[PDB]
Design a protein around this ligand. Structure first.
Ligand SMILES: CC(C)Sc1ccccc1NC(N)=O
Ligand SMILES: CC(C)Sc1ccccc1NC(N)=O
Lengths: 348, 348, 348, 348, 348
């Protein structure tokens, strides 16, 4: 007996949808859900989605409150829908997927992922929920996460971090590192060997290795000397070149974080969605150096050093394909006389 | 267990709120309520009120579907709220009253009209509903309607017509003529002697007397001769004067109806609400004669003839107060040499 | 090179989308599309759909402007989507189907109905469009309409009428009677023997048989005598009983049309969508007789007489299933002592 | 002569409504009020209320710009409306009360609080405004604040802090500590002995005692040793337990502030309104420990220590009622073998 | 071939409008532009302007991405429109000017500034764009910026800083100091000798002189002693007086910045637009000292000291006119016995 008033009751009393019985009076005005408290209207939800306000309110109330894979991972793995849950995209303030399975009558395409409509779609399955490993086994298409071993299924160790209520974290009180599994056309697909993005913020950037501590602490030339990085264009790629009107390089998050300590800058997120490679319209405030499309990736500096040092530097220009977050990221490698000139996540 | 989904279920299955159990999926987009049927969205309600869309939808679903007094009568009698019903104002496409009693949790000021918040308000009571005549006995302020006699109470015979789902009609299969009772501060009132407006439409105007049949059939001068109306300015007041840029007179609905048969005209209802006297910005299409504020009353021609023939015609200008629909309507009477020049419902 | 400006250009110059090149300046304000003409904004489209304004504008511009099956037929035949066209639902002011095939980039699930996403869906195909009869041969699920014969396929003669730009008509200058074909899981179906609804309006109702001319012209008792209809409750079912507070019967459109000539009434279309059986909240203006859910079907009086005369009248109450517009309509038949009491399209 | 243009003139010239004469041109588009400056539209107000945009704009312009009691205090004291002022709720971006008295024609229920409509409502009176102490004396229901002694009226010393234009502060240049008085049904009610919440922010939390300085500075075990708090479950209640998936305790703001210095966390304010006890959906970012409904109170640590040390610890579970901000806050006290297990503001 | 889909394509691929060919699918819902990515809608633009959503989206995409004069300078110079560009007002999130020239078909008044409609308007010309110096020479009214000498044209050295994508900065990698030129009625107007505002933020305020370093570092009395400022009311004007209910002075940004280090305060920007003098409704959080209209100017402390020391202090009150950002700012100078009492940017 699902209702707007019951969803609102659950939100008010339980902080989210928790299957409790009860109703609270609700006002819907424009794209906002209100509830009367002390005689006045109090905002419960503001619809930032393209779904109707009451539908979006229900999916947001029914969001997964356990640590879940970051939306960029689900996207990279081709996830279309989730089995009996809502993966909430906190970066977009909207559901990560168009439709639902057993969640809300307005968005539901099926009540159970066993229905034939779900066969062609890659359904997300959560091994932490009873019966979902078996539903993945029977699903034609799907992505499954588990906390442990599934008999006969070859696992892929996922990233250390997961999203818990919009907070990307490496769990200490909860497990955030999952085993990943994927099926395409009934066949269990082998997940490729991959690097993982670190999912760090520029404002609260923390180094996660001795090389990362040395990059942030040391001067440019003594870090490049210490790590034998001469001829790898780190001055351009990682540190950034702010001497000309067009900002040079600056494709690693750690480089933006080092710069951020000294001087601020504006990063325009013109396609605001979680992705392995992010594109920003950057304006350096100290110099006025800017670039409309500056691709940024948050790789551990050690991982980036390993990628660039594993490349053949004998050709003027070429595409270098690197598996990151299960997706193939194309990089553009430009060389001259055996040295790197630039290396950046290719603007497709 | 009131809900948006249950209200929508009732509307879809029962044509209105009927206390049935069940839920249908609903979409709220801007000011419109939709329901999914055959995979697509079907409009259930468009909010034309100042209330939130879901609140207005519920009060409209919970509207009184029995013949009820016309909103102009309830307003004239000082009705503030209704006991356990919604009087729907079909002319405003909104509830006739701000608040409710035992109808909707968002608009309710009380569950029963016996609550102290209702004592200062004139509560509308319906004798056709069990217990409401006795609820009117214990009510400090209120208006009661009945079909028959109430022991100890002297009735006031109301108008022949009532509103049934927005259709004003004189009932043949249902009773539409109610007895009216009013209480002010615990005291049963003596409702005044009153005329009633006929509530007719211009498009479907029907005469309700031999004088009204003679007005519509006969030529102007032979009707005025037949009914001894010489010197009462009917040529101006009732027939209308379309010879000058400013339209002269035309204050009785029957006169507009006679004109409407020959030539059309535009009536701009600039304050669209039910009222004893209506104000229109009229433009005669045949002549181009117009008037910004043309007060129109629908009185039975016999009643209007009685009112104008009962006036002293010896003063240039004066206010003539007439009880119509239980309210005091001020008229402006203009005379010259013992004859009427004009007589119109005063524009204040 | 599809664009908002190009769609608007086509609408302004061609009256609809016609694949012409060009752009006109457009304003989008709330749910309305405007274009500048003579320096001022002129309304091109008002979005009455649950789709975004520009998406709905494009599907409405791309609507099928040929006589097409009425949405109720497509719905009854299980049509999910149309192949490379938009069937516009003029009763809902919205697209008849959720998604499109080769029409609009925002709503498209495929460019051609041969794509695997379309195999589980019943795709509507139009033989009048080149290649669509052969696309229906290779389609797993679909409904085909043709004007003439298809080799190897046994036709189902559809209704005489079709919808041309929202006008339901029996074509004289165009063909409106199509042959219908349906395929379910690669298998050509044998469409059932069916009656068709006549799709007439109450305001412009025209008789389509000598019995229908006699019903509208003759008095109740002499029509019932002429056609030997005594004991079939036509007085109740077809003519209507307006003597009690609850309106009795009145389930055939011809009966509402006969009543409409004498007195008007209000029909509240509370679920406004095309369907074989329509449900109205009716209020008779002459008597005040009313009914919340009055099911109305527009059957040819001869067809209705044949259905009721082909029933066993020996049981108090039972469900009578009749194929109308290819769907199974349940009727409720109430009898007493071998005569009909009522017979109405069952309210479920 | 109140007007939209006059309100806008006052806002533009005086920073708020100041009774000045004049008009500025205004644009209303959707829920925003604009004014033309340098040829372009400049935003004056964005309506975040459920009132119409122009009505909300006027009440916001007419807001009380003097230090006023925090909305949680007014709510706890049962305040329904204010006498000739608008108490603006800066946390909700809306008026603290539904209706007004002598402020705005659209929201006014009366021009003066002496009108009979105000008798049943608890009217807020401000002794700093001439004649309001006398209006409280004559009011059937009311809450009065004063800066000093009122002859014969027994005062209640309120909190040290008040809200000045949305800034909660302890006044140095203005008085923020008021004497409070309350009347119910004509009778001056004795205000209970109460604790007060400190109204601090987590980001700018400042200790207000030597115990509070010692809690923030000292290690958990040496603070518990210094203040003889062994067996009072401060490790759970105040410090918080982040070792399990469900976050343990953490019900005092000072505890959240101590944690905030080391690691960040997300506090979801699912009912965003000022209240003595706040409920948050917390997610600790360092550990991933979370709780859907974590009740938090900002009590001075000395006051909380006094409350918990004044309880009988001989029963497994019981409700402990404590007057805080004039309201009775129920706490749940759980004990085992004479020691505290948990003590939290009860989730009603 | 301008289109919504092409603008969106440019934004998605190039970070702004860059004249590239291509189309991306777009959704318009309410005042937001979305694009489908990974099956879901991603927000491209939220309309905060009074223009239609698609029109505002196009002007924002077509915004000038080079360092441009701050909107306050353009306003002070009487700029009405820009030649073939959009000056984006990042403080208002809207175009700085009502109309465009050669930018967007919906807002364009002309394709080239040579059209007679542009003759009466002051058109902004950018010498960095080919042919714009010549268009200024031929324009009846205009403001021109250049990076160097224009033969025969007497230059005005503008401010050191310019706005680059909403970031006010003094360019190191780009030129931000322009030569300014103005024409009124065909005649090149001499720009006056002017002071410039520093355009600093309170949160990130940096001193730009030894006097400014000494003001922020030194105690009030020793700074006033060091710079011989006794009798110039700096204690009131620059430091601020927070001892009374009405906040005294505080008209220089550096003074607000010094206060901000010790205690926070609320600055209500009631007319949110870039201007030489800003008006704030300030509330000091430490003391509760407040002022509805506190005029604040960001002048270099040396420049302010020079202005106040160049005034005759022998009259009680007078208007002191100072050219700042090319506009004449009126100041109110109040003196007593040869000393300053107050000096503030006059509240007009
Ligand atoms: C008490 C009866 C003899 S009179 C009565 C009957 C029905 C309704 C009302 C009233 N009178 C009243 N004052 O409430
Ligand atoms: C193959 C033909 C003899 S039969 C045919 C002709 C036209 C449309 C459809 C079908 N049959 C089908 N199963 O698709």
């Amino acid at each position: 007996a699902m209702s707007l008033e019951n969803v609102a009751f659950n939100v008010v009393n339980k902080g989210h949808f928790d299957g409790q019985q009860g109703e609270v009076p609700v006002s819907i005005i424009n794209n906002t859900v209100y509830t009367k408290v002390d005689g006045v209207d109090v905002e419960l939800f503001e619809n930032k989605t393209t779904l109707p306000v009451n539908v979006a309110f229900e999916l947001w109330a029914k969001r997964n409150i356990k640590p879940v894979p970051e939306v960029k991972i689900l996207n990279n793995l081709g996830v279309d829908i989730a089995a009996n849950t809502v993966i909430w995209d906190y970066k977009r303030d909207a559901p990560a997927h168009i439709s639902t399975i057993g969640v809300c009558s307005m968005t539901d395409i099926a009540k159970k992922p066993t229905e034939t409509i779900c066969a062609p779609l890659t359904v997300f399955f959560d091994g932490r929920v009873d019966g979902q490993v078996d539903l993945f086994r029977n699903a034609r298409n799907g992505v499954l996460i588990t906390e442990g071993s599934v008999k006969g299924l070859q696992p892929s160790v996922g990233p250390k971090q997961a999203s818990l209520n919009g907070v990307t974290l490496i769990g200490e009180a909860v497990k955030t590192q999952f085993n990943y599994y994927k099926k395409v056309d009934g066949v269990v697909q082998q997940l490729p060997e991959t690097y993982f993005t670190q999912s760090r913020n520029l404002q609260e950037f923390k180094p996660r290795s001795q090389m990362e501590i040395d990059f942030l602490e040391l001067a440019m030339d003594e870090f490049i000397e210490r790590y034998k990085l001469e001829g790898y264009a780190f001055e351009h790629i990682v540190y950034g070149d702010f001497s000309h009107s067009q900002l040079g390089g600056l494709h690693l998050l750690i480089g933006l974080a080092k710069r951020f300590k000294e001087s601020p800058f504006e990063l325009e997120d013109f396609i605001p969605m979680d992705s392995t490679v992010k594109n920003y319209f950057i304006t350096d405030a100290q110099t006025g150096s800017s670039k409309c499309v500056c691709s940024v990736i948050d790789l551990l500096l050690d991982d980036f050093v390993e990628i660039i040092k594993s490349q053949d530097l004998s050709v003027v220009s070429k595409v270098v394909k690197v598996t990151i977050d299960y997706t193939e990221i194309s990089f553009m490698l430009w060389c001259k006389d055996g040295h790197v000139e630039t290396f950046y996540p290719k603007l497709q």
